[PDB]
Amino acid sequence: TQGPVHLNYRQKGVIDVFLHAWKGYRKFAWGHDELKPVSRSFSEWFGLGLTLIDALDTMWILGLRKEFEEARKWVSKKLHFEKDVDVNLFESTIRILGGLLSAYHLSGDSLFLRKAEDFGNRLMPAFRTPSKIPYSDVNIGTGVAHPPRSDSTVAEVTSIQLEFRELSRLTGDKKFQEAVEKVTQHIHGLSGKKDGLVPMFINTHSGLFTHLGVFTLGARADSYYEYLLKQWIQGGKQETQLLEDYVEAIEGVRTHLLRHSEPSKLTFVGELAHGRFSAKMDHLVCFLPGTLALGVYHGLPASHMELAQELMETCYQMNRQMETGLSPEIVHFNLYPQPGRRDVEVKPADRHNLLRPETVESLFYLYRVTGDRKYQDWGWEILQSFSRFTRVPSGGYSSINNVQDPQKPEPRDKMESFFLGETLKYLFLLFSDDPNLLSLDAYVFNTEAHPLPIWT
Ligand SMILES: OC[C@H]1NC[C@@H](O)[C@@H](O)[C@@H]1O
Ligand SMILES: [Ca+2]
């Protein structure tokens, strides 16, 4: 129960929260996908030690080597992909493949690469479709892929590129990169976009966008825009088509989904359905200011910076207007002049908070790019809310049902893997005053906070 002396107090705090969280996992869900902190149990989604894998690079970065070594032992002896189980190509890629690739790079342990290549190969069946656009699911054990319980979601097939490309680079096996790039290239020419904005679904057989006319930057589309830029940065900034699509998409966001609340004029991104704008914004969308700032660092328009700063402020407010200080799953904004009206509105069904990272993720980028200490302060405040309302005494942290009630937040008895894989990682990195720690010049984070090296 002692941490390194060099660490500033905020990073130590993050480490203290991690240990408490890791504690519950070690005692009640060791080797299992997700922890059930409240009931001191666990749940299985893939049965591949999701949380352990998703937290490998986080432990390494926080200097929790003893913990890392123990988790490394489990991967070495308990992780088996020879299982008859269906997995989502996207969720598997960003957490498992990305998680292993990061672990391999930070630790240098070839074990993680071996597992990654193994897993990468078991995921390939998913691309066996008429259009080459991948099926949503794939049984890693039997080798057969298939659509969900129809179509595939656009974000899902366009948010697996960084991982597959890197695996090809490290293994020399080009099939991973090729499959994944074919998808990106096909999406590039595909019509049905509204000034860069892509629809939520795409048919694996016809390879065409479906559910036309409905656009959103939240679930089902979000990371698509994120990976346009990140792939660009990953490839040494030479794949200009990615860049072009990205800047077009941003302008498209400005022109069709960007609005301002009343009476405070909070900048926010809403959803568009067949011409009808909806002042609705998923917390998921809070990744945008982060990606926006990232691009600015890499030479994108200064107008992108203002947008980033504005949206960072809004996402911050999305958390702070809540009684617990934690943002709800979805936030509606008031759009028309009404005196005593609040800017932020939240429907009862959306008052949940699953310890998502999007806000702290973007604060990290905003600070790295602006150097403005207030973003660190904001992150510190959010960590406090997590500690005060989501902490489980016996160990771990839990998602909650009521983000608006500090006396009865209502734990849902579940700790998402992205909490240790992302939320605490970004917070640790946010509180760092060393620009050389996973520099924006050398590394690029996949959509699950797993850092991958920028190529030369
Ligand atoms: O809130 C985060 C959750 N969904 C979006 C993904 O890109 C990843 O960040 C995590 O799976
Ligand atoms: Ca993400």
Which H/E stretch holds residue 35?
A: strand 34-36
How big, in percent rounded to 5, are the helix, strand and coil portions of the chain?
A: 50, 10, 40
**Does residue 418 have its Cβ closer than 6 Å to ligand 1?**
yes
Residue 176 and residue 165 in contact, taking contact as beta carbons nearer than 8 Å: yes
Report d(CA 181, CA 134) in Å as an integer.
12
Atom 2 (ligand 1) nearest CA: 356
Exposure string (b/e) for 217-250, b if CB count within 10 Å is 16 or more? bbebbbbbbbbbbbbbbbeeeebeebbebbbebb
Tell me if 129 is assigned to a ligand binding site.
Answer: no
Looking at 137, 329, 343, 422, which residue is catalytic? 329
Residue 413 and residue 395 in contact, taking contact as beta carbons nearer than 8 Å: no
Please tell me what DSSP assigns to residue 198: P
Atom of ligand 1 nearest to the CA of 284: 1
Atom 4 (ligand 1) nearest CA: 284
Report d(CA 370, CA 127) in Å as an integer.
41
Domain parsing of the chain, residue ranges: 1-456
Contacts of 73 (CB under 8 A, 6+ apart): none
The ligand placed nearest to the CA atom of residue 99 is 1
- Rounded to the nearest angstrom, the gap between the alpha carbon of residue 98 and the centroid of all alpha carbons in its chain is 11
Report d(CA 91, CA 156) in Å as an integer.
8
Atom 9 (ligand 1) nearest CA: 448
Nearest to 35 by CA among 25, 27, 45, 26: 25
Please tell me what DSSP assigns to residue 287: G
Q: Is residue 358 among the annotated active site residues?
A: yes
Looking at 34, 156, 222, 413, which residue is catalytic? 222
Residue 196 and residue 187 in contact, taking contact as beta carbons nearer than 8 Å: no
Report d(CA 358, CA 106) in Å as an integer.
23
Report d(CA 78, CA 115) in Å as an integer.
12
Q: What are residue 153's DSSP bridge partners?
A: 201
- Considering the four listed CATH numbers 1.10.8.50, 1.50.10.10, 1.10.3720.10, 3.40.50.150, the one that applies to the domain covering 1-456 is 1.50.10.10
Report d(CA 106, CA 94) in Å as an integer.
17
Instruction: Supply 220's token pair.
Output: 């089902």
Q: Is residue 91 among the annotated active site residues?
A: yes
Q: How far is the CA of 176 from the centre of ligand 1 (A)?
A: 22
Q: Is residue 69 among the annotated active site residues?
A: no
Residue 100 and residue 115 in contact, taking contact as beta carbons nearer than 8 Å: yes
Assign residue 17 a region: left if phi > 0, alpha if psi is -120 to 50, beta otherwise?
A: alpha
**Does residue 447 have its Cβ closer than 6 Å to ligand 1?**
yes
**Does residue 356 have its Cβ closer than 6 Å to ligand 1?**
yes
The neighbour count for residue 277, using CB atoms within 10 Å, is 13
> For this experimental structure, what is the resolution in angstroms?
2.4
Q: What are residue 269's DSSP bridge partners?
A: 258
Nearest to 25 by CA among 1, 56, 2: 56
- Rounded to 5 degrees, φ, ψ at 127 are -85, -5
Report d(CA 214, CA 277) in Å as an integer.
10
Atom of ligand 1 nearest to the CA of 223: 7
